[PDB]
Amino acid sequence: QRPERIKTTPYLEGDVLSSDSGPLLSVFALQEIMQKVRQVQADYMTATREVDFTVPDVQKILDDIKALAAEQVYKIVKVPSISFRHIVMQSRDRVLRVDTYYEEMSQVGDVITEDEPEKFYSTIIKKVRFIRGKGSFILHDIPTRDHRGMEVAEPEVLGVEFKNVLPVLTAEHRAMIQNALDGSIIENGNVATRDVDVFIGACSEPVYRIYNRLQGYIEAVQLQELRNSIGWLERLGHRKRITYSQEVLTDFRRQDTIWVLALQLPVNPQVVWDVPRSSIANLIMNIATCLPTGEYIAPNPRISSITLTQRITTTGPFAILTGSTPTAQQLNDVRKIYLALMFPGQIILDLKIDPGERMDPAVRMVAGVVGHLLFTAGGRFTNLTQNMARQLDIALNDYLLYMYNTRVQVNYGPTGEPLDFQIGRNQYDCNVFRADFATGTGYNGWATIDVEYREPAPYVHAQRYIRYCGIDSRELINPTTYGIGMTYHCYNEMLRMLVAAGKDSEAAYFRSMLPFHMVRFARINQIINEDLHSVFSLPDDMFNALLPDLIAGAHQNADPVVLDVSWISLWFAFNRSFEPTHRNEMLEVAPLIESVYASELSVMKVDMRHLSLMQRRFPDVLIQARPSHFWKAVLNDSPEAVKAVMNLSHSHNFINIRDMMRWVMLPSLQPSLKLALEEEAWAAANDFEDLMLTDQVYMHRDMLPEPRLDDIERFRQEGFYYTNMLEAPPEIDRVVQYTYEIARLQANMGQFRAALRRIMDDDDWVRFGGVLRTVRVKFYDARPPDDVLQGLPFSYDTIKYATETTIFYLIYNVEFSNTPDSLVLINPTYTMTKVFINKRIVERVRVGQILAVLNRRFVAYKGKMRIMDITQSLKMGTKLAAPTV
Amino acid sequence: QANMGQFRAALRRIMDDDDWVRFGGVLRTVRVKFYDARPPDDVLQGLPFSYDTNERGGLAYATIKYATETTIFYLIYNVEFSNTPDSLVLINPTYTMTKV
Amino acid sequence: QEVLTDFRRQDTIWVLALQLPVNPQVVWDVPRSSIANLIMNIATCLPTGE
């Protein structure tokens, strides 16, 4: 079924030794990093915070990111929001209207105090989610009716509740609004098959502003944007060589189906690689979704030995090594080497010294040869640390000199470094196999260009093609040299010094293993740059700085994890191949998983960016604020499936203040539909008056008004009412400004009560600006209690400066037997709190201006329409019919 | 052509001009049959292609497959003594749509 | 080198109570100590053989 996995000659046939996969290694690669820190913190005295090192179910996290693509942030309703009501007074021609959007705006959070900053941030972020949740509707299948030919709307599909006002009107005013109730006609409804409903209703201004943004998304995001989406998935599937089906996609849009499209497929990969301390979490999220299920393959057993007649057989040189079987700990270490060859600069290796084991002394010497022709210490990347590359030379120095045949001559050099001699009769210089990390002299990549750029990658951040030992993935298909001439320079020099040093039977083993060796690397190259090409791969800006920061010891933000393997596992890893059987199960669905995860990251960045300025604007509400406060706030108002990806290496406990502040100030945004609503909802909350909290709270002594009634009905029909809310604030002169610091210094000195009464007796106005306060609106027909009358903008405890205020509406209801001076007392009553909002919340109007709020243009749909989502259909297996130019 | 919905409308226009169409270039193995009376509805007008449209989530996919087997058939006529000359001639002809 | 190597090595404070390259004059300054620095050389570094 694939041209590189058809074996004709029986050279690549061997026993299956093991089998590993994607979700098996990603659990294993996390159970080896966390067991290294829990090991070396249990042997030495560590003084650190008690953090836990556990391993999450990585298979479950990959399902919940996939499940997060099946949510609709909008909602489909038949009627719109009401957002308006009226309170009937004692009058018969004047009622006062109540906007219920500002009523529900108050009771979504808590009372904002000046003490706790992390509750203030969660109270703010609760209010922004209220505007996003309320004003996201579609208005499908509204009910209507016919009235004298003209197509008019139902009385309930507007935004006015008038059920309580009808018994108090006169017979004139009932028909005066009935001619206006039938004036809300559907626009050009006389023609059939319009496919839309246009009428005029009434909704509040922040709720109406997001509703236009939801229509403007469907205005633009359409079949052309789906044409751009599948056109990128064909470019990824072109590289990954995935077999297509016969079924193609035709862009035929039905007459009654409307598509929404929340996500876009070309993901800006800088958003994923900007999360702080996420270099390990972006590695396990690459193993868990792009490794193919494969099997380890032993070589052909007739490579070493030939049987001549019956009892005359060639004996291999490494016979006691081939006659061995790895234990469970040593087979674990082969899975660390093949996890280090596939991820070149990201996973390095070391030695794992343990004293409770007495191996053969010849296993260390042979493993010095194998490591010099399996790993890479070249000038482009490295698989082995600068200490393991040192300990693989002393193992070679203790192998080229342990001569068990007759002694060849050897001329040592002036230094005392390992491998400084000239072994052999023809005196081969052995200095070249000592590792130098700037040119890679001993190991692979000696004279080989092993990293190259051939064509632009679908992903714009990884244009590299890894070619281990100068071998391309096409040499399994169209070879260039014969079977004898399969070689490369890093291996061939190892043979012609192993021959020159008297070991001319050991080199005959490695010379007959070159075609198995180069076939191994022809599949590692076909795994890296064909299957492991994701968003979570390492970008080329970081990949070209891993080696020159390993040498100079500089602080790197992409610290490669160092696993460690034993000595004999260099031999067991030499004799396996990892021929992949099937590709991964979630390979085609993974671009949807990367796009859901990256879009949900960018909605957190815009919430943290707007919340970061709340100390620079109102510095007196937040004295005890630090940037870790809103970091906990937006994380709590976030899906838990995304936080499982960010906290894979437990990076949530190890990041400091200056790391989270940098990620806020970084320009990288993955767009979506939800970001097009959240960025809009922060525009309508930039003044905080639509969130029902403000700083302009005044305090001024005023008496309750005594109305001098002479006619009962004229006192009734005007609608007399008292309200502490201002209509216009006082001037810049004749006002005294306080601050939080000014009142705090006078409260402990005791002069605060003394300085107030001189102001409260000389007819001046004092302002308590600087700190925002929760505003609640109340209505009262009888006398309200005195805690509402002589309530204070502050409180006692020192003082509290962020006490919640109250707006009370005192309406008068009198009877026929009321004395005209019955409301006159000998001593009056006083009120103190007065507040300015600059919002027309509650205002007394006439009956002629009841339906004067019908000015909201609405666009609705017919009942035959279907609102369908097509975000689930973004898979790699779909090839569309007409290809994109 | 099927993306613009003009696939079956184009093929009807090629047949209405009395023109010829050719599909692909696959080697198209040949079977040979013989008939003495009334070959069935699949030998005549045997369509050498297939066009089927499916819809998943309101997307209107389509599958187009070219056939690979062709049939060369031979139609031997058989007449009898009790046949009038205006019996074999029909009011509208039966169409054959396979040429090898 | 299995201690300088785990993934917390970027932010770690290594405290070391003993410098390793010993100035060997301070061992050979103990007066008339030539036998004690021979019994200690035997009972630390002498290998057992056949």
mmCIF file of C-alpha atoms in Angstrom, chain A residues 123-124 127 160 162 232 235 239 300 314 319 345 375 388 415 452 473 499 501 506 509 533 536 569 653 662 669 713 852:
data_model
loop_
_atom_site.group_PDB
_atom_site.id
_atom_site.type_symbol
_atom_site.label_atom_id
_atom_site.label_comp_id
_atom_site.label_asym_id
_atom_site.label_seq_id
_atom_site.Cartn_x
_atom_site.Cartn_y
_atom_site.Cartn_z
ATOM 1 C CA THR A 123 -16.268 40.738 39.477
ATOM 2 C CA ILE A 124 -15.160 42.707 36.405
ATOM 3 C CA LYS A 127 -19.671 41.511 33.918
ATOM 4 C CA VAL A 160 -41.701 47.012 25.683
ATOM 5 C CA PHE A 162 -46.956 47.492 28.902
ATOM 6 C CA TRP A 232 -4.658 24.844 3.568
ATOM 7 C CA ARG A 235 -1.303 21.686 1.492
ATOM 8 C CA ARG A 239 3.379 16.922 2.577
ATOM 9 C CA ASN A 300 18.426 -10.921 9.608
ATOM 10 C CA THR A 314 31.101 -18.897 10.929
ATOM 11 C CA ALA A 319 28.577 -13.501 19.974
ATOM 12 C CA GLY A 345 17.836 19.096 19.676
ATOM 13 C CA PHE A 375 24.542 9.637 17.443
ATOM 14 C CA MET A 388 28.359 11.829 27.404
ATOM 15 C CA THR A 415 48.881 15.700 25.376
ATOM 16 C CA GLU A 452 18.784 21.732 4.767
ATOM 17 C CA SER A 473 13.683 9.489 2.271
ATOM 18 C CA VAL A 499 40.878 -2.497 10.369
ATOM 19 C CA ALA A 501 44.233 -1.451 14.675
ATOM 20 C CA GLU A 506 35.111 -6.687 14.175
ATOM 21 C CA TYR A 509 30.636 -7.157 11.350
ATOM 22 C CA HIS A 533 5.322 18.409 11.282
ATOM 23 C CA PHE A 536 4.055 21.962 18.363
ATOM 24 C CA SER A 569 21.282 -0.068 25.758
ATOM 25 C CA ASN A 653 3.762 26.746 39.919
ATOM 26 C CA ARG A 662 5.755 39.758 29.189
ATOM 27 C CA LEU A 669 -3.423 36.879 18.113
ATOM 28 C CA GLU A 713 -55.431 65.562 40.966
ATOM 29 C CA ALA A 852 -40.895 56.495 21.714
#
